[PDB]
Design a protein around this ligand. Structure first.
Ligand code: HEC
Ligand code: HEC
Ligand code: HEC
Ligand code: HEC
Ligand code: HEC
Ligand code: HEC
Ligand code: HEC
Ligand code: HEC
Ligand code: HEC
Ligand code: HEC
Ligand code: HEC
Ligand code: HEC
Ligand code: HEC
Ligand code: HEC
Ligand SMILES: O=N[O-]
Ligand SMILES: O=N[O-]
Ligand SMILES: [Ca+2]
Ligand SMILES: [Ca+2]
Ligand SMILES: [Ca+2]
Ligand SMILES: [Ca+2]
Lengths: 519, 519, 104, 103
């Protein structure tokens, strides 16, 4: 059984924690619930850590007193189809292989599934670690509770004796790097300096061997990613988000200065040997839009190239950990601002961006966002009970599973079937424009080899490559984003019509040039 | 927000609490969660209380860290039909009014419903307070969460300016007294001496004005009735049960000395100044058979009469708070031992016992009890989750709502429909014998006025009255007991056949005597 | 509330409508249910319309006496997927864009 | 629901690798007329035809087999990755040869 420690003894050194812990709703929660610090207390000084205390990061540390929220979080939605490849006729992006050729996502890009699996899915996907990590057997794919307990309880490593990234199966890639892990776990929260910069006090950084880093990590989406464990108050911990909102002064709602002030973030920094080490962002309100934007954003978490001169931008560069914090129509300017692109297309040779699930940036300025609605209202609402103490659902999933609470409470004029029909109208329309954008992108891409072999000039091909950047951006945003237009239907429509317009311009350019060479 | 108190300072006086709190699973749970002792600490010495500290008895004091158990407890089972009178052709005892005439239960005796309602249902039933207390309106009957928050949030008092028991509606009775309340609430745990004996430190006792006592009570079935708040270990608090098991040396299982030793109870007494005041019984194991037997037993909680001379036994007498802790075939001897009966039948004049829900004493010696099965296995089993932290359901209800966990886990040879069929076979058979027992009891009762009017002698009428005692006991045990024979089908069968045998003997005696007088 | 008009006055000019209306199952259904023709009657000649009467074409003009048929007609089948593009792999014509290129 | 989810995990993964194998086979097949019309030698075309045998075998086994990988998921994965590897080798061969003829 746990025995309480004297928190006042801790507070003699730890004044920042004292200020947070004594004032919030965890003021009676003893340190022993999360820390084993006996040898630390015996050896520390005011400035030196001495022996390192143990800090629990397992979700079960919170489950003892908050079983309802924990059980809700670890639920597996079996209807969220698992390991479902997006590059197939029946999924999100039928022509993805042709359009993304030259990028690691071509090796595998499945649809998302329940949060319990995020860290194991990162480790096992074919594009990440060359197939090094696998489930112990095919039965383990169901075990959300096991994944939560720890990744290495359900996975194997093909070669525990080496730590290099290499292919163990032929059709895999080795795209993973330490920055990726910040959106899968925060087990490394005390071992990683802000932004992943080199630091004397950091075990891990942007330049670490990712296989060794992986082996040190266990838990998905720790409870403390949104809740400070000392104050119990709302926060974010993700460095790139704090960098965009606070360091670069963009605010929590870059399109709305007033909302940014009412619903802002305060950066708190913790030091090692009196040098800045790590940081968190305390929130003015319990604002899920900003909590969820720790991960559901467009980002850099990878090496790339400069638009200016084509030169390599490696993991050592700050640009390898970056939140653009820009909507689709501001993105090109944002990428030019840091002089960066992701890959060169394998067929066209065009410099292209790679887009990541931009739900937060897409939600800005939408009808629901402008009306004060937030991600949690639709995806993790309050539970309704005939008799019982209300709590917030932590099962982040589609509103279709809870339409009464997610939609119909605001939309009294609708039945459930009417609300679903409204969602499907938008998704069906948006998906048709994604498919049409792919048709025109593919038509343009296929003309590049014909043009090159016909002797079309580099000047004309380069003009077409410049159009490919825009045609790609204004399409891929929408296959990357998970709502199939629902989060901002008018923006999706304008963007996809732009993609098609750009591809058509490029098709006309190339066909005319081919025809002139032939004549 | 709560601010923790210095528990070590409390322990300078409170060594008995220290020895419990420091060792169990609530060692890190600060006193401020349940006590407001600021003025107490300012004024006390180790030998003088000073200002009385406040103690919380509300269930929300526990719900804060144990929401899953609380929410399960407060659930209302709408299929448990409410306010359903037992004295009707479609319920448990069709001829109850004829058989029970002379007793307060004739005014109203409904089937039980969900635990959330126990204190409000006690206050509003027609037999208890002369109709003084009612729900604020007829809508409030659904409000389990409100009842748990407090009886007086959902009830009204017809006359707040008087405290006497009287009739406010014509067909009511005033049977309630302070002993009743010990099986509805333990809000008074610090205000009631062991057994409800008179005590200088007790606000309330067996002889209190029950209307005044009622007004001071709020919460049903407090969480601490089965769980010590300081150690978190398993216990009982009900005085009558501790008295039977420990003081009278009967043991937790009177028919099994080995099981009584393995699964025993330790009486712990708490003093006020130099004097013993209150007590609890700490359990060796988390034994729900004994936890539920705090209430689901046959008891005295009322005035009565002596079998020896017919003299009144009032609330002042220790016999007014008594657990017989005896099976149906040992009951008559247990009542003779204390020289007690409940009422004189309105028609026959016979001295009779009144039986109360004897589930615990019925369960003894049954096949399931002999195999180490306990109440919780069928009525509050562990929850089964595909992914999640297991906890124990606290919704104490029929196994029919959870047959997978409550029966089929042990009975793999059966489908749900087969298990239900086996339960119904027993209940149908038992109920047929209850109805036959009532037929023969009513036939006997109806002969008494005929016999008296025909000039049958008092010696013969007295012989028939002695038979009425047994015919009554061996029938009413089973209408009082809630399983309709399921908890012990062979015992129900043997007892009900005995009831019918006794009634037939009395019918023959009376018919022969009537016929001889005529013739 | 509607007030009936003298249909025989209308029929003095409108012999084609008379032949149809007097014989079928709407012979008792007054013109006012669908037409507002007061100024028309005051200004028309046998050959010239005069002021144009109002003619109701809303479906609710029939719904007053035939609510069952109207309610059946306006039902929305939510299972008939809305705004679903045919030129996609999961619909009627996966290669429609290539095959129909040049058409709106 | 857990057992069905386990089946669907394997079928979904296998089907994605069948679709990717078809993408690479189709890409190789479409280069044959371009190569022939560009004057690529019979020797190079015959090398590509030898690769086509393997690319075809290690794909078609899985469209022919009815379990979409469930009957032997590790074998399906190894085979389909081989198909894709063979098609990629053939695509590279043909593209390089076409490009040399054009230059
Ligand atoms: C002064 C002698 C201290 C005592 C008393 C306690 N801690 Fe400490 N701790 C101290 C220092 C100088 C540092 C390095 C960071 C800094 O503020 O300069 C720490 C660090 C920690 C940490 C972080 C460990 C990590 O892996 O990075 C934790 C979780 C921590 N300390 C906990 C802790 C507890 C629970 C204490 C009371 C039991 C306690 N510390 C006392 C200095 C001192
Ligand atoms: C779980 C409910 C915890 C409670 C109770 C306590 N701590 Fe904590 N602590 C916890 C976590 C998950 C972390 C990682 C960092 C994060 O922000 O989530 C920490 C960290 C610390 C640190 C390090 C701060 C730094 O310099 O980086 C310290 C010094 C610390 N914790 C102290 C501390 C004290 C003294 C506590 C009792 C009053 C205490 N913590 C409780 C989790 C939890
Ligand atoms: C028992 C020893 C606890 C541990 C372990 C954890 N929490 Fe907690 N939490 C606890 C209490 C008694 C309360 C106050 C309840 C009340 O409403 O009065 C809380 C509260 C929270 C909250 C709400 C905070 C707020 O609204 O301001 C959150 C978000 C929360 N707790 C989170 C949380 C986390 C993430 C934990 C693991 C790191 C955790 N709690 C542990 C008691 C206990
Ligand atoms: C008994 C006759 C079984 C039948 C019927 C089914 N399964 Fe099975 N399965 C069985 C065993 C003994 C094992 C090996 C497990 C062990 O003991 O180590 C398995 C394994 C699986 C797996 C993992 C396969 C892998 O390649 O790693 C899966 C995904 C699985 N089983 C699923 C499954 C399904 C869906 C079934 C019904 C169609 C099924 N099994 C039946 C034993 C038996
Ligand atoms: C936060 C800005 C993230 C970064 C950095 C990485 N990922 Fe990610 N990932 C993130 C979200 C919000 C989601 C769910 C939404 C979605 O569109 O999928 C994911 C999902 C994955 C998955 C599962 C789906 C799939 O693509 O197969 C995997 C396997 C995955 N992510 C891997 C991965 C890699 C290898 C990363 C570094 C190169 C990486 N992620 C970074 C959020 C973020
Ligand atoms: C961000 C992605 C979150 C993660 C990770 C966790 N929680 Fe959470 N929590 C989140 C929100 C948006 C809210 C509602 C806040 C509001 O006021 O609208 C909560 C709330 C809680 C609470 C408070 C009680 C309640 O409303 O249910 C608790 C005690 C809590 N959360 C606990 C908790 C646990 C145990 C987690 C890991 C299993 C966890 N939270 C993660 C957002 C996020
Ligand atoms: C209601 C007004 C919503 C708000 C606020 C947010 N989302 Fe949403 N989301 C919504 C719908 C109707 C859908 C389509 C769901 C369907 O079943 O068709 C989505 C979808 C997503 C998804 C994919 C979910 C899935 O299909 O399983 C994700 C990952 C998602 N949404 C994330 C998300 C974020 C991060 C939000 C705040 C920035 C957000 N959503 C708000 C409806 C609503
Ligand atoms: C010695 C100076 C004491 C200190 C320090 C604390 N308590 Fe106390 N307490 C003390 C006495 C002499 C008594 C009366 C004992 C008797 O003979 O009757 C008490 C009583 C209580 C009670 C019970 C009150 C009741 O309703 O009967 C409680 C709940 C209690 N005390 C709590 C308590 C707390 C939480 C303390 C630390 C904050 C604390 N006490 C300190 C003597 C002394
Ligand atoms: C948070 C501040 C708590 C309050 C308020 C209550 N309980 Fe508690 N309880 C708490 C913890 C951290 C634990 C240990 C969890 C673990 O398994 O480590 C417990 C444990 C219990 C138990 C189980 C005890 C055992 O198995 O030995 C019970 C029965 C229990 N708690 C009951 C209970 C009651 C009745 C409360 C109101 C009087 C109560 N708890 C409040 C945390 C907290
Ligand atoms: C609007 C036209 C109503 C209809 C339809 C139903 N109820 Fe009603 N009910 C309504 C009002 C305005 C009130 C009084 C609330 C107040 O101001 O106090 C009620 C009351 C009840 C009650 C309590 C009756 C009592 O004597 O205390 C019950 C049990 C009740 N309502 C139930 C009920 C049922 C079951 C209905 C469908 C048959 C129903 N109501 C319809 C308003 C309206
Ligand atoms: C513990 C030994 C009890 C005593 C003392 C009293 N009651 Fe009771 N009561 C008890 C149980 C286990 C149950 C549920 C099982 C059942 O057979 O009903 C009840 C139920 C009630 C009810 C609801 C059902 C009904 O009879 O209408 C009421 C209204 C009620 N009890 C009242 C009551 C009175 C007035 C008491 C003192 C004379 C009394 N109870 C004492 C357990 C115990
Ligand atoms: C006796 C009638 C009980 C009442 C009143 C309460 N609980 Fe309980 N609890 C009871 C049993 C038989 C058990 C299981 C013991 C076993 O080991 O088999 C429990 C268990 C708990 C626990 C431990 C965790 C778990 O198993 O769920 C906790 C934290 C707990 N109970 C809390 C709790 C609360 C909050 C109550 C009031 C709402 C409550 N218990 C009342 C029996 C009884
Ligand atoms: C002779 C003086 C007429 C009288 C009496 C009525 N109508 Fe007439 N109408 C008349 C003419 C010459 C025309 C033009 C068409 C033709 O037959 O030559 C009309 C036209 C109409 C129409 C059609 C209007 C339109 O928008 O096209 C309607 C609906 C109509 N008339 C209705 C109508 C009614 C209901 C009358 C009795 C109240 C009526 N008309 C009398 C000539 C004459
Ligand atoms: C009431 C004032 C009516 C108005 C307005 C409309 N209709 Fe009607 N209709 C009416 C009657 C009394 C009848 C006869 C019912 C019977 O079976 O005896 C009808 C009939 C029809 C029919 C059936 C005709 C047939 O089978 O021969 C149809 C198709 C019909 N009515 C259509 C209809 C239309 C389309 C209307 C709006 C332009 C309309 N009716 C109005 C009474 C009334
Ligand atoms: O990309 N995840
Ligand atoms: N209780 O009767
Ligand atoms: Ca999904
Ligand atoms: Ca990107
Ligand atoms: Ca019942
Ligand atoms: Ca009794």
């Amino acid at each position: 059984n746990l025995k309480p420690v004297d928190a006042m003894q801790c507070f003699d050194c730890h004044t920042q924690i004292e200020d947070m812990h004594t004032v919030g709703k965890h003021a009676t929660v003893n340190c022993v619930h999360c820390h084993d610090a006996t040898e630390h207390v015996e050896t520390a000084s005011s400035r030196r850590m001495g022996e390192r205390p143990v800090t629990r990061m397992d979700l079960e540390a919170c489950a003892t007193c908050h079983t309802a929220q924990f059980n809700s979080f670890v639920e597996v939605r079996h209807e969220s189809h698992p390991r479902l490849e997006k590059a197939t006729p029946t999924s999100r992006s039928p022509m993805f292989d042709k359009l993304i050729a030259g990028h690691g996502f071509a090796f595998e890009h499945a649809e998302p599934r329940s949060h319990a699996f995020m860290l194991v899915d990162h480790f096992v996907v074919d594009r990440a670690y060359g197939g090094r990590f696998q489930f112990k057997n095919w039965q383990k794919v169901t075990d959300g509770m096991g994944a939560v307990r720890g990744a290495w309880t359900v996975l194997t490593d093909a070669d525990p004796e080496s730590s290099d990234q290499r292919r163990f199966l032929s059709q895999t890639a080795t795209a993973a790097n330490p920055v990726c892990l910040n959106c899968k776990t925060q087990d490394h929260i005390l071992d990683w300096a802000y932004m992943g910069d080199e630091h004397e006090a950091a075990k891990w950084s942007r330049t670490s061997e990712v296989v060794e880093f992986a082996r040190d990590l266990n838990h998905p989406l720790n409870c403390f990613m949104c809740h400070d464990p000392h104050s119990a108050g709302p926060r974010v911990v993700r460095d790139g988000l704090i960098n965009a909102v606070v360091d670069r002064g963009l605010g929590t709602y870059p399109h709305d200065p007033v909302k940014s002030e009412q619903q802002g973030m305060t950066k708190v920094t913790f030091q090692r040997g009196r040098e800045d080490f790590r940081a968190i962002g305390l929130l003015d309100t319990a604002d899920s839009n900003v909590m969820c934007a720790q991960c559901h954003v467009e980002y850099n978490c990878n090496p790339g190239y400069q638009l200016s001169d084509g030169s390599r931008v490696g993991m050592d560069d700050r640009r390898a950990n970056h939140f653009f914090w820009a909507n689709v129509f501001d993105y090109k300017e944002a990428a030019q601002e840091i002089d960066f692109f992701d890959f060169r297309h394998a067929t066209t040779g065009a410099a292209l961006p790679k887009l990541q699930h931009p739900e937060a940036e897409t939600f800005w300025g939408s009808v629901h966002e402008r009306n004060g609605v937030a991600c949690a209202d639709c995806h993790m609402p309050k539970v309704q009970l005939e008799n019982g103490k209300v709590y917030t659902s932590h099962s982040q999933r589609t509103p279709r599973d809870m339409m009464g609470q997610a939609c119909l409470n605001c939309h009294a004029e609708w039945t459930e079937d009417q609300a679903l029909y409204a969602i499907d109208y938008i998704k069906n329309y948006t998906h048709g424009k994604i498919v049409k954008s792919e048709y025109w992108l593919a038509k343009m891409i296929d003309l590049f080899p014909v043009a090159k072999r016909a002797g079309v000039s580099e000047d004309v091909l380069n003009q077409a490559r410049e159009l490919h950047y825009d045609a790609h951006l204004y399409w891929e945003w929408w296959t990357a984003e998970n709502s199939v237009g629902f989060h901002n239907p008018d923006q999706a429509r304008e963007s996809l019509m732009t993609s098609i317009s750009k591809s058509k311009e490029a098709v006309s350019l190339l066909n005319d040039a081919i025809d002139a060479q032939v004549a």
